[PDB]
Design a protein around this ligand. Sequence first.
Ligand SMILES: CCCCCCCCCCCCC/C=C/[C@H](O)[C@H](N)CO
Lengths: 243, 243, 284, 41
Amino acid sequence: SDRVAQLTVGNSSITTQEAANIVLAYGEWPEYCPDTDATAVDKPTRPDVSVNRFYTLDSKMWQENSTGWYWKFPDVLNKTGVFGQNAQFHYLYRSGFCLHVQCNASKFHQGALLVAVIPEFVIAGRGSNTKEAPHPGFTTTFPGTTGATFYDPYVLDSGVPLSQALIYPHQWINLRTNNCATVIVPYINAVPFDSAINHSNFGLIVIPVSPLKYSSGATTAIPITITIAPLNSEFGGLRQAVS
Amino acid sequence: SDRVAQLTVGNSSITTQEAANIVLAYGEWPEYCPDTDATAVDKPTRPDVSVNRFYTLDSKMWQENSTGWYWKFPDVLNKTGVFGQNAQFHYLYRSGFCLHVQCNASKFHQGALLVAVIPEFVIAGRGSNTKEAPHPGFTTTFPGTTGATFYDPYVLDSGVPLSQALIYPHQWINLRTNNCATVIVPYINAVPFDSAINHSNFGLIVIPVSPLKYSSGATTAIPITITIAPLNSEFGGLRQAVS
Amino acid sequence: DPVEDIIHRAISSATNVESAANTTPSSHRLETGRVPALQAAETGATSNATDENMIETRCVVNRNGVLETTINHFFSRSGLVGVVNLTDGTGYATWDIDIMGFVQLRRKCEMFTYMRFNAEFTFVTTTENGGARPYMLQYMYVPPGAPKPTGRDAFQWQTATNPSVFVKLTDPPAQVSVPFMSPASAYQWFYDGYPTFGQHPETSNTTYGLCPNNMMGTFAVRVVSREASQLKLQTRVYMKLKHVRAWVPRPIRSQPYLLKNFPNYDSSKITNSARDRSSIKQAN
Amino acid sequence: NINYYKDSYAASATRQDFTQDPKKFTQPVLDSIRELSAPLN
Ligand SMILES: CCCCCCCCCCCCC/C=C/[C@H](O)[C@H](N)CO
């Protein structure tokens, strides 16, 4: 009655039989923008079925010497589905999310992942220059659906240590206990509406802390799939398409 | 709600996740000596935190050809801690106990132990003489913290068969079911107070009935640890130290 | 009667806490099924095992103060944010107001993502040999878009609209209060995004992380005189965060700092968070 | 509790806050767990 769960959003549903729990980020639910906090004077669009559903990204194979991964939200969904078409025709944007990272392994495998959610996750450059200076490319800061591997996961590629990164909303995927992590995140920004193309709010991060080990003869290919879903999404400022 | 337990006594606590149940010896709890049964005319000392806590003894490796083991209580705690110092300065003694024998093994191991509690367990000699006669040494009758291995576990080294030894308070450590046995014993003696140095009340006994078997490649070292704890202990008759 | 499906809370709870928590007396537990020591760290929650359920405790009426640890008493301590060098003989000096250049107050402010505060500046101006020479100074505040002064005696120093402070070197140091001047609803120290649209490059994009909601203007200073006096100056600007609110905590910096606006580090020399010891099996 | 200007930001530090709400950082989960029970069952 606690290890079994089902999450139906839109026309899609996720079952699980070996879950742990569900984490609300900072104790709050994603909701629509109230009238006392809105600053635009147009009426927003709210599709509410066509954009609030579970989108499944690609799978990441987890190996012995993986140094870890990061996506940007809502960067990964600007080109998939009707959420990718409403986020290009409209200047303004507001949503929550509901994340789910699946990774199964047998009773003879061991290891652990750290699935956390970092608001305003800024990538650092990797040079000893005091001004010129190195800055990350656009496919490194805004990677898309294929993510990006960390170079230095010990400092999260931002000069900030992983050992204190449990202050963010997070779960663990311990292969002897569970196989999935679920984090529900509200809209966290200093402005009520903001653009979905320039500004990615937060970044999902999956880093294997204890490495994958298995005895000989076991299944060598352990993939990590990620299924995300917008919640309470609304757009504004209709114009022509800009990607 | 029955396989999980925690036992906090004093400043120490034991967790377990694969237990069976807890046995009260003869349906009674250890308590203090009432005024209608006391025979001394001095006031007893009751430390109640410093002497009522879980003392962990050493570990016994369990092998293929083990014939079994026995300790004497309160012999093993006359030299450890503040219970070992209150049992030397004081002539009189009264307590209960709370025993816990830990032994874990994997899902590919098999075997069973018999953890019983024998009041007034008298060691026999092993000679065919009708008077001189052989009698056991002092390190065989009162072994201490290192215990003593049985020579003939089929007759419990006292001419009394093991097959009827389930009349004592006991549990089993079956390696497919549990990993720990807990027996809570009151004070069983014909006198209200008695000396803690001459007279050991009962004896804990761990005998492997069905032997340890494991297939090749498994972990070969299976230890047996024993963690005991006095309960409701009180002393009397202060004098100089006698060990 | 029409289409039907057109018709179709939180967790935390704040408590006013004055002193630290007390401790109630405990006893011994001898029973099965109820275990406070076993946790599951995979659920994303911290352990809730209190010390009354691990050991046997006593009754302690605790009277310690939890007052100095709040975010108002932690940030209302003024520290150095900028040093303006003025050598007279172009005659003036400017300073783009950016407090991310000095490291004592930066690392305290990088614990959080969004902060909303008022400020209280103080300008300690001395000479290069110690100070105290009776000359008169002018400190303008130039908002974004206002014309910066282009000369020692230019017309932008008439100062008919924007604020300015006249004070001598031999007076006590000048001190003002500054409101929340951002167009957003919070100063954000980490802005994962780009300010403008367009094709962003791969080699060197110097605009990644630039948050224009934080750029607050320019601070100009001259010596109020006609002929150029010949004396070298330094001002020191001390900001005190007051009336401060903070959101979304984040981990504290562990790597040594490099640039003002960018959180760079070198990957060839990564300093460990814990200083080394001999082995794992000994404590000293 | 005094101010010599009409501008509310020119004042000193305001009244003390005295509150904290650690349940949004320590235990941000839906199924609320007790202490004396196993968290996974
Ligand atoms: C004669 C008075 C001149 C001094 C007046 C200074 C007023 C401007 C201060 C604005 C508030 C602080 C500036 C912003 C803080 C941080 O440096 C920025 N957010 C940098 O990210």
